Amino acid sequence: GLTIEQVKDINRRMSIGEAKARRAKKEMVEANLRLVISIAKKYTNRGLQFLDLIQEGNIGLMKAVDKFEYRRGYKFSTYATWWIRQA
């Protein structure tokens, strides 16, 4: 129900906001890889290998960083490790 010319304008500016945020979150999911292996000692030999253990650990950190609020009393080193041990 939109013009083929203007419909592109809506999406072209969405790739700008998601890009400035994506690259900005690539620095938090790289310097915090030490916390993933830290709590990865509670689910070692059980049924899944260690190589596939930090798999659900890295995906969890990338989820918490997105739903994180710097304007909140709780820090990140505690709020992020919540979704990690959940995956």
Added chain:
DNA sequence: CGCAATAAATGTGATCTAGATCACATTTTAGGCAAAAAAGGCTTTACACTTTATGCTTCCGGCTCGTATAATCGCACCTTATGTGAGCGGATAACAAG
């Protein structure tokens, strides 16, 4: 015709069974025909099969969610110590050529 010698054939005749007779009265035999007891026949009725739609209920079954919590850390102690040679690529030292 008389003579040889191992096998087969000969007589005896009193004793004791073996096999046969007769005509008529008694006892056995055969297959015959219904009845009873049994085989399957071919009916018509008594019941029983799992199946499958369903939906309602309680109990046991199988699966997740968020929350609450402390942490993102720390010693001293017990007992051993794989086997080799053969095949291979890579790193280093000694060498002749330029």
